[PDB]
Design a protein around this ligand. Structure first.
Ligand SMILES: *CCS(=O)(=O)c1c(F)c(F)c(S(N)(=O)=O)c(F)c1NC1CCCCCCC1
Ligand SMILES: [Zn+2]
Length: 257
């Protein structure tokens, strides 16, 4: 099926998913000199005090921390967004080495990894309906650089050995995603897509300028996960990122001057 291997990677996805060559594909390069400050944008509102984590899952292409989204408990509002978007999960993309891993780039710079906090527009009732809409999802993207350890990440790192292989899950309650945020919420925003099949063009992207720092040891443990299922030959889960896609007829806006 599709993946990030030698023969089923991003350059092949268009054969099953023709929207791969569409008009609003993600990720993109963020050219910092061309992004225009938009004084009409509002400050982001991140309300995660009531977030309730449930489970961590190895789904074969990343690991997901899933939240209880049966109520408005953890929501993203404001900035470019109209209405209320509810947190459903977060996951990461990372590299085989520190010089690559992110999906978005900044002046062509690649970070070691990229965190995505996925939210769905509650006016559409469920996420399945939301992904059929141009304003169905809001994904908050946060770059990871290697330096000092991120203490709020270690609980995630420590459970990864329990979900090594595709299809494994573990209980993962009481995790606070506010521990993964940088200091500043300054951001770039643009209309785009999911970065994995089915590549639906349903996302407002909000990509924070400030990266978080994680340690070498923390990211090394991401790279011990497996794409394969238990009992199959080991394929390390590394380089699960899609490269930058053409910007086409889109403008990237900055929240900051
Ligand atoms: C392949 C599913 S995933 O790992 O959960 C997943 C992913 F890898 C992604 F890269 C995106 S992204 N970058 O576009 O944000 C993503 F949204 C993923 N999962 C969502 C689940 C949330 C419900 C909406 C349905 C879209 C897939
Ligand atoms: Zn993602």
């Amino acid at each position: 099926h599709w993946g990030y291997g030698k023969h089923n990677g991003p350059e092949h996805w268009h054969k099953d998913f023709p929207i791969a060559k569409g008009e609003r594909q993600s990720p993109v390069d963020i050219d910092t000199h061309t992004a225009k400050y938009d004084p009409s944008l509002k400050p982001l509102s991140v309300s995660y005090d009531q977030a309730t984590s449930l489970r961590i899952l190895n789904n074969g292409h990343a690991f997901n921390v899933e939240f209880d989204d049966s109520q408005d408990k953890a929501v993203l509002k404001g900035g470019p967004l109209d209405g209320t978007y509810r947190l459903i999960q977060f996951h990461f993309h990372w590299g085989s080495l520190d010089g690559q891993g992110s999906e978005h780039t900044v002046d062509k710079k690649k970070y070691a990894a990229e965190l995505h906090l996925v939210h769905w527009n509650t006016k559409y009732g469920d996420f399945g309906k939301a992904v059929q809409q141009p304003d169905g999802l809001a994904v908050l993207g946060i770059f990871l650089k290697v330096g000092s350890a991120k203490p709020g990440l270690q609980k995630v790192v420590d459970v990864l050995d329990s979900i090594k292989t595709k299809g494994k899950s573990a209980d993962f309650t009481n995790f606070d995603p506010r521990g993964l945020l940088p200091e500043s919420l300054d951001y770039w925003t643009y209309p785009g897509s999911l970065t994995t099949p089915p590549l639906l063009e349903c996302v407002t992207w909000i990509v924070l300028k400030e990266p978080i720092s994680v340690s070498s040891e923390q990211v090394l443990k991401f790279r011990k996960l497996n794409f394969n299922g238990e009992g199959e030959p080991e394929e390390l889960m590394v380089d699960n990122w899609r490269p930058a896609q053409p910007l086409k007829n889109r403008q990237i806006k900055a929240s900051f001057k």
